[PDB]
Symmetry: C3
Subunit: 185 residues, 3 copies
């Protein structure tokens, strides 16, 4: 019955699997909103993405939008054709926003753009006829103070997660594949 | 009614805002103990610090002491003139202690000095007529094994947080701006 | 009454002390399974290991096996001679497995070998006449995307922790020396 759920956790914390279970709880027909871009060459996410697509249930729909996510989802009209939505993921949305900027070492343009994306998503989810689960990462519990771009990314993603968690009806923090309830109405 | 509260969390986890809410719960007149030094030049924390000071309630008092914090707070006499204290923050107290040492690659002098600071704070808070909330960081849940100074910092801050959490009446761990109760009497 | 317990947390999070308390709850005679190798030269863990051995209760038994841990424990026959087991630790088991591979920048051989170790441990613990507590690290909540070997390690350790946490009867996540219950029957 949760209209908006945020699932966050570390690298290999089981957060995607848990979010997908939640989404399957919405209904048979889920919209999978994918924000990762598949690059050519070294460092490509192509293999992981292909295996994700292969394992995806056949009744689910996939929308690939690395940026302007609320705009793209809304104008697709698919929210009226599905039972619920899973957004995978805020981590890559934040990265896409950072590297779209002229100078990744400048915090302000990146932060303003990322907050705009997040507020547009909040607004769309508020109006959405179907529930959403969003996947994001915790990246702020180590020591990443080496370069300005990494510090800026960590700050901006932390702020995005704060905004989403505040709007979300339920928030889960994954530890080794198991959920800790952080927020539940 | 909590005499000593520890609030810790990652980068941009909402821990300062939550600690300030707790402190406002103490009374109108709060002593803000600030351990960050404002440097000249690049990498200065001047902008963030100025905005912090601008947003601070006008009835609060500010004491800037980067080192020997218990000594400085105690000899100021301000504990008898306020309703409660917020210490911001243990992360920078630990950094100040590390870089005050002759050789940051040597673990023992840094660790002994930091434990001395923490024990002096524990003793002062035990004697304090007003409650305290302390802000600190979690930095041990990534991979920071590159240089000796960073490993030493992570160890020492972890030990400081263990000591404080053991003494504290309440301990909160922030996830995306929301508190998880780790300890509550 | 917990047959298998997983204790994980960050650097200097109190996880070893908490696991040792749990193990002492098993009985007087505990098997300490140590996976760290003591190297000669710089970066050696010799000092920490020696102090660990000095503080160890005299009725405990120590088995040093950096690899093929389930095989070594099982063929020692010690499970029939003790009250319980503490495995210290999965972090170093994963590191030992990574650096035993021909090319640490290749994810697949490392991952397959580590999963084999973990499944062998799961099988042994399932058959064990005495309970186990296992110590592991959370390393996935920072930003470690710099080199392939570190990313691979983080992924593999996360997967190992997921497998263990799924099999474990109880799972604890340490924050500043205090346990958060993640799973308890």
């Amino acid at each position: 019955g949760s209209h908006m759920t945020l699932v966050l956790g570390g690298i290999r914390s089981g957060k995607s699997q848990y979010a997908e279970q939640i989404a399957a709880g919405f209904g048979k027909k889920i919209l999978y909103v994918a924000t990762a871009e598949v690059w050519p060459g070294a460092g490509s996410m192509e293999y992981r993405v292909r295996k994700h697509q292969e394992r995806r249930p056949k009744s689910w729909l996939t929308l690939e939008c690395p940026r302007h996510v609320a705009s793209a989802v809304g104008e697709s009209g698919l929210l009226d054709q599905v039972d619920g939505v899973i957004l995978e993921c805020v981590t890559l949305l934040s990265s896409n926003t950072l590297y779209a900027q002229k100078d990744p070492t400048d915090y302000e343009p990146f932060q303003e753009a990322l907050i705009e994306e997040i507020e547009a998503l909040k607004k769309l989810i508020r109006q959405s006829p179907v529930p959403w689960v969003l996947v994001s990462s915790e990246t702020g519990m180590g020591i990443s103070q080496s370069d300005a771009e990494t510090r800026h990314y960590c700050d901006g993603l932390g702020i995005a997660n704060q905004l989403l968690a505040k709007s979300a009806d339920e928030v889960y923090f994954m530890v080794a594949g198991l959920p800790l309830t952080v927020k539940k109405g």
